[PDB]
From a paper:
As an important member, 4-hydroxyphenylpyruvate dioxygenase (HPPD) catalyzes the complex transformation of 4-hydroxyphenylpyruvate acid (HPPA) to homogentisic acid (HGA), a key step in the tyrosine catabolic pathway that is common to all the aerobic organisms. In plants, HGA is a key intermediate in the biosynthesis of tocopherols and plastoquinones, which are essential compounds for the photosynthesis. Inhibition of the enzyme results in foliage bleaching of plants and eventually death, and thus HPPD inhibitors have been developed as herbicides for many years. Each monomeric unit consists of nine α-helices and sixteen β-strands that form two barrel-shaped structural domains: a conserved C-terminal domain containing the active site and a diversified N-terminal loop domain.
Inhibitory kinetic analysis towards the recombinant AtHPPD indicated that Y13161 is a competitive inhibitor (Ki = 24.16 ± 1.01 nM) with respect to HPPA with the characteristic of slow binding (and). Similar to all the known inhibitors, two carbonyl groups on Y13161 formed clear chelation interaction between its two carbonyl groups with the metal ion and a pronounced π-π stacking interaction between quinazoline-2,4-dione moiety and two aromatic residues (Phe381 and Phe424) (, and). Additionally, the cyclohexane moiety interacts with the surrounding hydrophobic residues like Phe419, Pro280, Val269, and Val228. Intriguingly, the benzene ring at the N-1 position of the quinazoline-2,4-dione ring formed π-π stacking interaction with Phe392, which results in the more complementary in shape to HPPD active site. It should be pointed out that the interaction with Phe392 has never been observed before in other HPPD inhibitor complexes. Most importantly, the conformation of the active site of AtHPPD-Y13161 overlaps very well with that of the holo-AtHPPD, but remarkably different from that of AtHPPD-HPPA complex, suggesting that the binding of Y13161 indeed keep HPPD in inactive state as expected. As a consequence, the H-bond network of Ser267-Asn282-Gln307-Gln293 would not form due to the far distance (~5.0 Å) between Gln293 and Gln307. On the contrary, the H-bond network of Glu394-Gln379-Asn423 appears around the Y13161, just like its presence in the active site of holo-AtHPPD structure. Collectively, these observations confirmed solidly that targeting the conformational change of Gln293 is an effective way to design new HPPD inhibitors. Overall, due to its excellent herbicidal activity, crop safety, and toxicological properties, Y13161 (the approved common name is Benquitrione) has progressed into industry development and will get registration as a selective herbicide for the weed control in sorghum field from the Institute for the Control of Agrochemicals, Ministry of Agriculture (ICAMA) of China.
Residue numbers in the entry:
A (entry chain A), B (entry chain A): 35 to 194, 201 to 250, 262 to 287, 291 to 403, 411 to 432
């Protein structure tokens, strides 16, 4: 059931901001490995003396990579005179975040109708403020509140390309890479305790709720297009607890990137795993794919089923739809954040968000496949 | 003239160690953009709880990329019990280095006959010690002394693959990339004052000395295969001063990578500039290549000359030989460290090091070409 209890009008995921130590190298690695286009920048060449920010896009997916310059470049600046394009940025916060967690997501940004209203309502319902609403170039309003750990939920609202202060990248430097990724499906956080974390986030958004490892629940917006699952560990080793130990606390676990064609996406990504791209988790045993026809035989032809076997793609099914999924290795040095590629089948109305679930059935289907 | 005044037996450049925030993403970017093979690792999967280190190799060129884990992973370790494979590593030093300078070279490593003797003699002749000699697995000895800024000169000596504690990468994860790079030619540092810096480094090594921008001199070993130029700025804007401001002091400016075939190297690197690799500085004006036949007409055929024009390759000449060179854009966010590709022609005896010089003539040949 959908109570539709959003306390402000939420639309879609807008962007994901990574806080790194060197934004150039991460952006280039991600661009090549994921097939994302280099489309906007904010740095020294655009007059930003505070931070380097490079935007990658694939369809509607927007990845932002930000790193701090030497504070000496902007020592005489104050906040009213800053040359930073993202006003919530903070040298001390960024360096502390990066040295504490390593590479990871700082901001999950969602587009809203009015960021300042979204901030006010959120704080009045228990959200811890992080950056107050600020209007950029009389065009865009941005505000941030705490989500979990050091991750903040960012509200963006437009009066009427990314943000003021960003430059469109020249076509010569912008290679039209595309492996089929089109938008962000969901963003999942790991916390030490799911109870307080759900109560906190559901408390200020009004989002409703959608033997190995974790306990989890999924918070969703009204149209169920903004999906925010959260994991806690179970003790008795949990992948969630390993994340908390290596990340130094709560944070974002994985980003799910919907592909228009997961087969092409995975062929392009796997071709590049060993030449600068991303490695994937080991494939399921062949017993797993020898049981797929037993479950998804009416959805996937056995030509397509065996194509999932070469690519290592997982299949799960739901009340209303079918899910195709695969997980990469951790994106950086630490066994923390990783990426999942998905494509959903069913629930045609547009496609309703969350069609197929999130792969809970794949835990027992893989536990039993390895026998 | 060559005084051959080395105070200990120096052989060759051994490796360059980059200190980064995330060693996975930098290594992968460098691997793809430069065509270097992923050949050794030291991290969690090999029992290293202190730091992640990934070695790239192309011919004899060895690039090492190191980042610190969370100190919590090794809080109970002391130096005699450390699981770090590089014992000179220090969480506080690495994070301070990276947050102060951004991505850059921490260690220029040269192979010597006896690292502990090299350290003792160096310190007794005025070198500031950084890490005392330590014997690894009764096989390799490592020691470090300060070079300039936070860059240390590292001595490696072998009793008889990189270091103890590193694992050979499995062939499945090791793609044989190769764009023609074969060894490190020279490593150049920028300092605020060339006088004290030369006196300091020449003082403890015994190395002998080999209107726009800089003042520089080149220190060399006996066989002149280890070459260490140093730049200072001239005021009246200097690229050297810009480096010092953005790097927060002295450091390594550029690494010169000798290619067996600079034409193929540059074609492979340029093909990849916009898909995760490295950008190059803008090419000289066509007037420059319209004057190349006037100077190098006896060395390069005009088919090869015009091939330098498409690639943007610079040509300089010496008393004894000819130099081919090109410079990349800065490797990271800050306008600091960059890379130069070179191939030397002449001085056949093996080829004697430094054949062709370092491109001093290209300053006036480019100043006059732009007219
Ligand atoms: C990738 C990996 C590495 C080491 C250990 C493990 C358990 C895993 N791992 C997963 O992380 C994983 C995650 C999801 C997933 O996306 C998901 C959750 O199940 C929680 C609810 C929200 C959500 O979206 C589904 C299936 C998974 N499976 C099957 C899996 O094996
Ligand atoms: C690449 C770039 C960017 C912005 C500003 C400038 C001056 C440059 N720049 C160089 O840095 C450069 C460096 C060398 C060089 O390698 C070298 C030196 O001349 C000092 C002695 C040791 C040594 O090896 C040669 C030619 C150069 N030229 C011609 C050039 O234009
Ligand atoms: Co998921
Ligand atoms: Co040089």
């Amino acid at each position: 059931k959908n109570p539709k209890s959003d306390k402000f009008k939420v639309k879609r995921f807008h962007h994901i901001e990574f806080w790194c130590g060197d934004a150039t190298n991460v952006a280039r690695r991600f661009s090549w490995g994921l097939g994302m286009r280099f489309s906007a920048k904010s740095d020294l060449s655009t007059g930003n003396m505070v931070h380097a920010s490079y935007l990658l896009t694939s369809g509607d997916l927007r990845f932002l990579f930000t790193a701090p310059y030497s504070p000496s470049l902007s020592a005489g600046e104050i906040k009213p005179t800053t040359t930073a394009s993202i006003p919530s940025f903070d040298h001390g916060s960024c360096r502390s975040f990066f040295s504490s967690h390593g590479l990871g997501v700082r901001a999950v940004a969602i587009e809203v109708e009015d960021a300042e209203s979204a901030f006010s309502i959120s704080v009045a319902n228990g959200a811890i403020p992080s950056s107050p609403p600020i209007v950029l170039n009389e065009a865009v309003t941005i505000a941030e509140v705490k989500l979990y750990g050091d991750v903040v939920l960012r509200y963006v609202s437009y009066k009427a390309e990314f943000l003021p202060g960003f430059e469109r990248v020249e076509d010569a430097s912008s290679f039209p890479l595309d492996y089929g990724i089109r938008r962000l499906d969901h963003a999942v956080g790991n916390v030490p305790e799911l109870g307080p974390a759900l109560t906190y986030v559901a408390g200020f958004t009004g989002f409703h709720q959608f033997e190995s490892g974790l306990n989890s629940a999924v918070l969703a917006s009204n149209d169920e297009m903004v999906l925010l699952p959260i994991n806690e560990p179970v003790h008795g080793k949990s992948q969630i607890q390993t994340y908390l130990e290596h990340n130094e606390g709560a944070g974002l676990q994985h980003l799910a990137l919907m592909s228009e064609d997961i087969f092409r996406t995975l062929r392009e990504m796997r071709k590049r795993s060993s030449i600068g791209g991303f490695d994937f988790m080991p494939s399921p045993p062949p017993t797993y794919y020898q049981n797929l026809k037993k479950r998804v035989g009416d959805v996937l032809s056995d030509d397509q089923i065996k194509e999932c076997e070469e690519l290592g793609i997982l299949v799960d099914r739901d009340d209303q739809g079918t899910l195709l999924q695969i997980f990469t290795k951790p994106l950086g040095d630490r066994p923390t954040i990783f990426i999942e590629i998905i494509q959903r089948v069913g629930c045609m109305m547009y496609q309703s968000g969350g069609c197929g679930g999130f792969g809970k059935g794949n835990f027992s289907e893989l536990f039993k496949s390895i026998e």
